[PDB]
């Protein structure tokens, strides 16, 4: 078919549990899954993408259930505790894919930039099809 250009979008927003963040630093992911991502976690121009592949890395805060008696014992000696994140990345939908042809990334507070209330950053990825 005639060139049909898709537009994929993801927002990282402020949350009651703490900020979502666009990033490459995503847990429980094999090297191969991270292969085409730039250092910001945004997929590189000129890269073929297939259903399930990451376009934009994102992590959100999960969890915060009360600590175990074990995790409290440590909370004094080994240092104060710390928090768990989950993969909430933008991934190519079923039945789609192609070649990345452009990306756009905007950050709240940059000159001239106006994002939705709550949004810290937004990334768009364009793919051929």
């Amino acid at each position: 078919g005639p060139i049909h250009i898709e537009r994929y979008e993801i927002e990282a927003r402020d949350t009651k549990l703490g900020p979502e963040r666009i990033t490459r630093d995503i847990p429980h992911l094999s090297e191969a899954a991270l292969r085409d991502l730039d250092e910001e976690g945004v997929v590189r121009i000129g890269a073929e993408v297939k259903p399930g592949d990451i376009l934009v890395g994102r992590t959100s805060f999960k969890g915060e259930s009360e600590p175990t008696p074990e995790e409290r014992l440590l909370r004094s000696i080994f240092g104060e505790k710390a928090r768990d994140v989950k993969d909430t990345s933008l991934r190519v939908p079923p039945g789609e894919g192609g070649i990345v042809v452009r990306t756009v990334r905007l950050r709240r507070g940059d000159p001239g930039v106006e994002l939705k209330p709550g949004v810290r950053e937004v990334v768009r990825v364009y793919v051929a099809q």
């Binding site: 910001e40 590189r44 710390a82």
Partner: protein, 102 residues
């Protein structure tokens, strides 16, 4: 070490702010560590990091893995295994290989 500099430097670059990395220590909780397969690696003690190269959002580190011991009239950490890894802006360690036990 050199092949890990190679893998690290092949991460594509991007204009962004520099991140402040988590300098984990014998004093602090080690961050989550993953093998190249994506499997969680659970250390038997805390770690120390040595930065080798840096990228605005990722850095290359040598990770020293420790085991607490009886020393003096108290306890402190002494060495167990090491691995090269990249670390990101959530502080997570991505190992390039299973840790070499010393």
């Amino acid at each position: 070490v050199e092949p890990y500099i190679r893998l690290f430097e092949a991460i594509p670059d991007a204009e962004t702010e520099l991140a402040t990395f988590y300098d984990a220590d014998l004093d602090t909780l080690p961050p989550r560590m993953f093998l190249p397969s994506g499997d969680l690696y659970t250390p038997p003690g805390p770690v120390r990091l040595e930065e080798i190269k840096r990228k605005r959002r990722v850095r290359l580190v040598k990770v020293s893995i420790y085991r607490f011991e009886h020393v003096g009239l108290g306890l402190a950490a002494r060495p167990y295994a090491y691995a090269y890894a990249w670390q990101g802006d959530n502080g997570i360690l991505h190992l390039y290989h299973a840790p070499v036990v010393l």
